[PDB]
Write a structure and sequence with these properties.
It catalyses: Ca(2+)(in) = Ca(2+)(out); Mg(2+)(in) = Mg(2+)(out); Na(+)(in) = Na(+)(out); K(+)(in) = K(+)(out). This protein is mainly alpha-helical. The chain has 24 helices and four strands. The protein has helices at about 5-10, 15-20, 20-25, 45-50, 60-70, 75, 90-95, 100-110, 135-145, 145-155, 175-180, 185-200, 220-225, 230-240, 280-285, 300-310, 315-335, 355-385, 395-415, 420-435, 445-480, 520-525, 545-560, 560-600; strands at about 80, 85-90, 265, 610-615.
């Protein structure tokens, strides 16, 4: 025909102009595309299915039969849209999207396929307007609760829907329902109960297929994916799953030796038996926190398991802290009792218990330092943290990398045998004694306390630093200009006195050389945390402007801004406090789970969980013994 003829006749939906269609494109025996859209592929059944018009698509038949004399009839009904946006898109998809019933019934009776991928640019996520749909009419049919067309798209006179099927990214109905599900409890409840009916007739019309056993292209089960995008509700459903029908082991919360007062909820710990893939904390942690990573530990197998594994095995962490604590004591006693001679690598201060004991402490201290380097290299090749271009997370990892770097440079320049090995040693000292608070992860009120200081310290570290270093650097330079004579480190000379003058060792120079106030400027920076006071010079109190000026900076900064960040980190205290429990159970589970995951080369124990419950409520019956 012509284009506006077909567009008009689907604008009306009047079959009286469809009356001449069969003969008018049967004498010519005309095909379908030679006519339909070159951009999309929208057929008459498509351009009439798009508009709903009371759900009654009447043109299921005439281009199917024009496409039967020209022979494209299931090709009439299953012309996937070749638009980029609407891609892979059939009319059964629209028939679901219009939420009607004639469209599904005489679209399927027009021969519509069921297993067909709709890999649409409209139909996948960006974080923008286009989001993932299901990409296959069963998948989005379940994702839209439409049990009439899930049921229908199974029960078709041509095709039962493949339950085990996958989709465009590998994202099956598991990944479609889960991935479309967010923390909206209407969305959550529909994507749980609708999914459960898909497992019910999903376990009745097509049983004998384990759908959750399927992993995606990334190798993630729906437990791994639902436990990967941070949906504690769905994973909670997965381990909450309990099918009261033939027969039993679909469930995950079993109740054997159970009782009215005394419930015993048996679990499975497939979360911890998932060794052929990643563990469950691994895949909550990767990808971490799509809304929330810390939330998912509090659920009963993960929390109770993370408790009992510590209290049964990993409360032996005090051996690790014991060896490390004795290590750091060795570091600080070799550093303390070092000889005051200028020449390093002395043969012996005295052939006695002292200097020989110091040689033992030296060989022990680098002999454990090489183990710290081995541990971080296992962390790096094996763990591949830190993140690519991201922030300093995690803090003590790169603090450990900087301590290890500075102490192997200490070993290098000590092997060069110059005196400067020692300030590096004091830096290694303050980063290890600093790193003692990583060993506070263990026990109860101090582990809760340790996660508290881990939280507020991990947040407010750089936040107070950008106040501190910048305000104090500005006003610091203001005090270096005022006042000190012999003000020539700069400009046309070496201004910086070749700052970081040590080649390939670091910031070892006289950097930022002052106006003959270098010692007075490290000394005023040492005054800047409130020590020394009140000198004047050849300004001689014409700098009363500088007096009131320091009253202005000390005014707005020293008191008037000092109360700000304490107060809003107390707002963090107003928010993070319950979240610090999630961070507590998590960091306990990282000390534990990472501890057994690293332990060179470890043992474990894998047997079915069971959780005692002493609660009181009625309810009798049995699972038929």
């Amino acid at each position: 025909f012509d284009r506006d003829r077909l567009f008009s006749v689907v604008s009306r939906g009047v079959p009286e102009e469809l009356t001449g269609l069969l003969e008018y494109l049967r004498w010519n025996s005309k095909y379908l595309t030679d006519y339909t859209e070159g951009s999309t592929g929208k057929t008459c059944l498509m351009k009439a299915v798009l508009n709903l018009q009371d759900g009654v698509n009447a043109c299921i038949m005439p281009l199917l039969q024009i496409d039967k004399d020209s022979g494209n009839p299931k090709p009439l009904v299953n012309a996937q849209c070749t638009d980029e946006f609407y891609q892979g898109h059939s009319a059964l998809h629209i028939a679901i999207e219009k939420r009607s019933l004639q469209c599904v019934k005489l679209l399927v009776e027009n021969g519509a396929d069921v297993h067909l991928r709709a890999c649409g640019r409209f139909f996948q996520k960006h974080q923008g307007t286009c989001f993932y749909f299901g990409e296959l009419p069963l998948s989005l049919a379940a994702c839209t609760k439409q049990w009439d067309v899930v049921t229908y798209l199974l029960e078709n006179p041509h095709q039962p829907a493949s339950l085990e099927a996958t989709d465009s990214l590998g994202n099956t109905v598991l990944h479609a329902l889960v991935m479309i599900a967010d923390n909206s409890p209407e969305n959550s409840a529909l994507v749980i109960h609708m999914y459960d009916g898909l497992l019910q007739m999903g376990a009745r019309l097509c049983p004998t297929v384990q759908l959750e056993e399927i992993s995606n292209h990334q190798g993630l089960t729906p437990l791994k994916l639902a436990a990967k995008e941070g949906k504690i509700e769905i994973f909670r459903h997965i381990l909450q799953r309990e099918f009261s029908g033939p027969y039993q082991p679909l469930s995950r919360k079993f109740t054997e030796w159970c009782y009215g007062p005394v419930r015993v909820s048996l679990y499975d710990l497939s979360s911890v038996d998932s060794w052929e893939k990643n563990s469950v904390l691994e895949i909550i942690a990767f990808h971490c926190k799509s809304p929330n990573r810390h939330r998912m530990v509090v659920l009963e197998p993960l929390n109770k398991l993370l408790q009992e594994k510590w209290d049964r095995l990993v409360s032996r962490f005090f051996f690790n802290f014991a060896c490390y604590l004795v290590y750091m004591f060795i570091f600080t006693v070799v550093a303390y009792h070092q000889p005051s001679l200028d020449q390093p690598a002395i043969p012996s201060s005295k052939a006695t218990f002292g200097e020989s004991m110091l040689l033992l402490g030296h060989i022990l201290i680098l002999l454990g330092g090489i183990y710290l380097l081995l541990g971080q290299l296992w962390y790096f090749w094996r763990r591949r943290l830190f993140i690519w271009i991201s922030f300093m997370d995690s803090y003590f990892e790169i603090l450990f990398l900087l301590q290890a770097l500075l102490t192997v440079l200490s070993q290098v320049l000590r092997f060069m045998e110059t005196e400067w090995y020692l300030p590096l040693l004091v830096l290694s000292l303050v980063l290890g004694w600093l790193n003692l608070l990583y060993y506070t992860r263990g026990f109860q009120h101090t582990g809760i306390y340790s996660v508290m200081i881990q939280k507020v310290i991990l947040r407010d570290l750089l936040r107070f630093l950008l106040v501190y270093l910048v305000f104090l650097f500005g006003f610091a330079v203001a005090l270096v200009s005022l006042s000190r004579e012999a003000r020539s480190p700069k400009a046309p000379e070496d201004n910086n006195s070749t700052v970081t003058e040590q080649p390939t060792v670091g910031q070892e120079e006289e950097p930022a050389p002052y106006r003959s106030i270098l010692d007075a400027s490290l000394e005023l920076f040492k005054f800047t945390i409130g020590m020394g006071e009140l000198a004047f010079q050849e300004q001689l109190r014409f700098r009363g402007v500088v007096l009131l000026l320091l009253l202005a900076y000390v005014l707005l900064t020293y008191v008037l801004l000092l109360n700000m960040l304490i107060a809003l980190m107390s707002e963090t205290v107003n928010h993070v406090a319950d979240n610090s429990w999630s961070i507590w159970k998590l960091q306990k589970a990282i000390s534990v789970l990472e501890m057994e995951n690293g332990y060179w080369w470890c043992r474990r124990k894998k047997h079915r969980e069971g959780r005692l419950l002493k609660v009181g409520t009625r309810g009798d019956g049995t699972p038929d013994e």
